[PDB]
Design brief:
binds a molecule of 2 linked components (NAG-NAG), lambda, part of a larger assembly, SARS-CoV-2, 3 chains, binds 2-acetamido-2-deoxy-beta-D-glucopyranose, four-stranded mixed beta sheet, Spike glycoprotein, viral protein
Chain lengths: 216, 274, 246
């Protein structure tokens, strides 16, 4: 970088004391903060194993103090198997680690399922000859737990000398006790919307003749 | 002394990131197993030379994907306290899921969504997609050669709507600006007195004794906390306006792509084909 | 019979396989117990809801034990440890601290309860389409062609049982888009022309069931000089033989 004869203290983007000249001499130096990152621990079930691997995030393995530097960081404590299996504990950028067979933590490249082609031809058709009726589940949340919080007790522990001060802050409490009440009413409306779609209650006859289909 | 304010923020942002991975995995990973087109191409006159992946290319992006990739300080932010984690599915994998969906859609029809991927000639399939919008099959074959040209030339124009016109990709480009808008507004907050006598902690630390520095430092901390919560809340809200966009894409990818949809003006404008 | 008829298979598939079909479904419910009898991660979504809400309160409650910059964390303490005129400055720091700790809890609920209003509205939609009728939105009610469903309650939620139809062994065969008899083309009324190599047949698209190409299940248009893939074959007619019977 070049400094005009009257320049130090290059902020150079927003407010950071970037490249700066020096006293005792005239040299245009530069400043960069030391390397930083957030460590993270990848571990299987505690009962299954006590061995853990460590993923230093976004740092060259040469400045860490059987490593394998990945696009996310510097994973230490895992063997890079070429093998490709389903993701178990996602790391990032296409690396997913798992506890496989002795027994240790490995890391590899994700496999987006298996592979096959299709026998596409100008005059060829495929027709199935059988069926498999199957049953699946999907499990949807509907409502939270209807709650509420009175302010002037949580904030001031029944101290009039505190309530006197609290009144000065305007209608903060009214807003909160209105919002939470709105939430609770919405929860009742929610639980009433999903189920109460039938106007009138039915019941099966005491005899059961559905054609072989047991609903016991 | 301020309690567990940090734990809350670092939990919320981590939740956001996990949700983003779940989002990107929901839209594309609807097919269990990767397909690929046969080396020979006999689809009845229909030329997909621009959407199918080009092997003579470093990545497996096709032409339109390359065009879209072309139509859209980076590190000063990193120094203060920020970072950016990389996505779980890299571009190569994402551009490979998509190839499977195009590969299946042309040789299987739709039956590769329900069960096992059946095989059907393309010219047969369009007969049973016309048959779903009230026109008989005889309309297709008696106009097959013309119809292919109408579609092949249609792809000809879709390049030019992207080749030079850049406002087509408005929605995504608007997303990136807003997020990068937040960080800069967040970063510049680090240079405000907030009522204190300076804006650098090392300054005020090396310019006053111990007993009198706390009162000044307090004004800075409460100021920066407020500047950080306000950034987190936007992300909590803004990321909830995209969870409602992926859920609208996952719905289209399961109806428009994996079959024929009759919801008027859902998949297109007019009677939908594929 | 009238729910098969909604996914492109005829009614005769059902009765001619009624006894088998019942067993396939009855045994299906047999396994769904075991997916819940011992496996506990099945009910992940609801159990994740309860933890988050109880996570907030504990984070909220422990905030009641922080100086926030004050000289203590109990009002009765500071009230019984300083005179009137000097207590207000200390108490102020506590109030502004606790207000901030309460708003931050409310805002989460305002947001989090808006991510569940978008879940009930997705359940009320399924309960009005999956349950109260048959839905053709692909991969909405199940994975495969949809047949019916069953609601089941659960603590703060709802559980469905999407019964579904899924094909099996697929056999490859030679096809042809049309058949030309006397110049005139011949298209299937509903089905695909198919051949084992020997003779030609027409079948529905989701269950192999060959039939003879009669003039009832076929309709004609134009001559066979413009379609591609046209094949030469006869078309049987049933209105001839009963005439010759005389
Ligand atoms: C379709 O699948 C069902 C279920 O697998 C078959 O029914 C069984 O067939 C085997 C012989 O392959 C018998 O031993 C069993 O007793 C049958 N009953 C069941 C429900 O297990 C049926 O045969 C298959 N049909 C076709 C066309 O392949
Ligand atoms: C499908 O379209 C592409 C163009 O998008 C055709 O590719 C070109 O063909 C001409 C004539 O052979 C060549 O001169 C060009 O170099 C080809 N490349 C491109 C990308 O322009 C392709 O031949 C068409 N295929 C079919 C089946 O018609
Ligand atoms: C169906 O049969 C007709 C009658 O045999 C075929 O028409 C003949 O076509 C060949 C050339 O392929 C000519 O050399 C003959 O003179 C034609 N005979 C006529 C006009 O009666 C027709 O090609 C056959 N089509 C198929 C699909 O096999
Ligand atoms: C509906 O299915 C249940 C569960 O399979 C059946 O319950 C069994 O009933 C028999 C007596 O018939 C008992 O001996 C079993 O212990 C019960 N449970 C088990 C473990 O199978 C119920 O009978 C079925 N209903 C019909 C009419 O078949
Ligand atoms: C190809 O198709 C023909 C269809 O006719 C099969 O021949 C059968 O024809 C009759 C039933 O339509 C019956 O006589 C037999 O089931 C059967 N065999 C005879 C004697 O023609 C034929 O099996 C099929 N398979 C081949 C040989 O490709
Ligand atoms: C000025 O600084 C230089 C470098 O430290 C030194 O060599 C020189 O003697 C100094 N001159 C003085 C003492 O003014
Ligand atoms: C880490 O540092 C070494 C030595 O400077 C260098 O060769 C390497 O490219 C750096 N990064 C990686 C990818 O390890
Ligand atoms: C199908 O096969 C090839 C094209 O791949 C060609 O001979 C012709 O289009 C078709 N032939 C038959 C057997 O119908
Ligand atoms: C159809 O062909 C494919 C590819 O050769 C094969 O895997 C499949 O088993 C065949 N189906 C049958 C049994 O006809
Ligand atoms: C390990 O497995 C046991 C038995 O299933 C279970 O009780 C325990 O919670 C598990 N602990 C983990 C996953 O760390
Ligand atoms: C497999 O071989 C590759 C080199 O081709 C190596 O990078 C990788 O670590 C090996 N993994 C093992 C030990 O299975």
């Amino acid at each position: 970088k070049k400094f005009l004869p009257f320049q130090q203290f290059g902020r150079d983007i927003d407010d950071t004391t970037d490249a700066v000249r020096d006293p005792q001499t005239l040299e245009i130096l530069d400043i960069t903060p030391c390397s930083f990152g957030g460590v993270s621990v990848i571990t299987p079930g505690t009962n299954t194993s006590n061995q853990v691997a460590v993923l230093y995030q976004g740092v060259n393995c040469t400045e860490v103090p059987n490593v394998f530097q990945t696009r996310a960081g510097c994973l230490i404590g895992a063997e890079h198997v070429n093998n490709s299996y389903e993701c178990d504990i996602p790391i990032g950028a296409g690396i997913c680690a798992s506890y496989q067979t002795s027994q240790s933590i490995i890391a590899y490249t994700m496999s987006l399922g298996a592979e096959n082609s299709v026998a596409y031809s100008n005059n060829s058709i495929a027709i199935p000859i059988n069926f498999t009726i199957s049953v699946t589940t999907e499990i949807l949340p509907v409502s939270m737990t209807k709650t509420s919080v009175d302010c002037t007790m949580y904030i001031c522990g029944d101290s009039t000398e505190c309530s006197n001060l609290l009144l000065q802050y305007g209608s903060f409490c009214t807003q909160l006790n209105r919002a939470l009440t709105g939430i609770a009413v919405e929860q009742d409306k929610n639980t009433q919307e999903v189920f109460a779609q039938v106007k009138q209650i039915y019941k099966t006859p005491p005899i059961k003749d559905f054609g072989g289909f047991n609903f016991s | 002394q301020y309690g567990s304010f940090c734990t809350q923020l670092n939990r919320a942002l981590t939740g956001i990131a996990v949700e983003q991975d779940k989002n990107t995995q929901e839209v594309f990973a609807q097919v269990k197993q990767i397909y690929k087109t046969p080396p020979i191409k006999d689809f009845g006159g229909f030329n997909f030379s621009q959407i199918l992946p080009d092997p003579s290319k470093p990545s497996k992006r096709s032409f339109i994907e390359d065009l879209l990739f072309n139509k859209v300080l980076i590190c000063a932010q990193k120094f203060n306290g920020l970072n950016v984690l990389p996505p779980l599915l890299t571009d190569e994998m994402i551009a490979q899921y998509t190839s499977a969906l195009l590969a299946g859609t042309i040789t299987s029809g739709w039956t590769f969504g329900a069960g096992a991927a059946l095989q059907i000639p393309f010219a047969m399939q369009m007969a049973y997609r016309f048959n779903g919008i009230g026109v008989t099959q005889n309309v297709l074959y008696e106009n097959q050669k013309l119809i292919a040209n109408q579609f092949n030339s249609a792809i000809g124009k879709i390049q030019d709507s992207l080749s030079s016109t850049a406002s087509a990709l408005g929605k995504l480009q608007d997303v990136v600006n807003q997020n990068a808008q937040a960080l800069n507004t967040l970063v510049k907050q680090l240079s405000s007195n907030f009522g204190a006598i300076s804006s650098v902690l090392n300054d005020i630390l090396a310019r006053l004794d111990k007993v009198e520095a706390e009162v000044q430092i307090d004004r800075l901390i409460t100021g920066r906390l407020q500047s950080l919560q306000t950034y987190v809340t936007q992300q909590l809200i803004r990321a909830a306006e995209i969870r409602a966009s992926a859920n609208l894409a996952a719905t289209k990818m399961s109806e428009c792509v994996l079959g024929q949809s009759k919801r008027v003006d859902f998949c297109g404008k007019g009677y939908h084909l594929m | 019979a009238y729910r098969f008829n909604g996914i492109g298979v005829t009614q005769n598939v059902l009765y001619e396989n009624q006894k088998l079909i019942a067993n396939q479904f009855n045994s299906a419910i047999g396994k769904i117990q075991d997916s819940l009898s011992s496996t506990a991660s099945a009910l992940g979504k609801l159990q994740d809801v309860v933890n988050q809400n109880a996570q907030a309160l504990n984070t909220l409650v422990k905030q009641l034990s922080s100086n926030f910059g004050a000289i203590s964390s109990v009002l009765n303490d500071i009230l019984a440890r300083l005179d009137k005129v000097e207590a207000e400055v200390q108490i102020d720091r506590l109030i502004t601290g606790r207000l901030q700790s309460l708003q931050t809890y409310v805002t989460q609920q305002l947001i989090r309860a808006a991510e569940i209003r978008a879940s009930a509205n997705l359940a009320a939609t399924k309960m009005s389409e999956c349950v109260l009728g048959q839905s053709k939105r692909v991969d909405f009610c199940g994975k495969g062609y949809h047949l019916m469903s069953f609601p089941q309650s659960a603590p703060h939620g709802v559980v469905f049982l999407h019964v579904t139809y899924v094909p099996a062994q697929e056999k490859n065969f030679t096809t042809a888009p049309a058949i030309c008899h006397d110049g005139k083309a011949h298209f299937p009324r509903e089905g695909v022309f198919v051949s084992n190599g020997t003779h030609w047949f027409v079948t529905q698209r989701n269950f192999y069931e060959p039939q003879i190409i009669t003039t009832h299940n076929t309709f004609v248009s134009g001559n066979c000089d413009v379609v591609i893939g046209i094949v030469n074959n006869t078309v049987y007619d049933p209105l001839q033989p009963e005439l010759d019977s005389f």
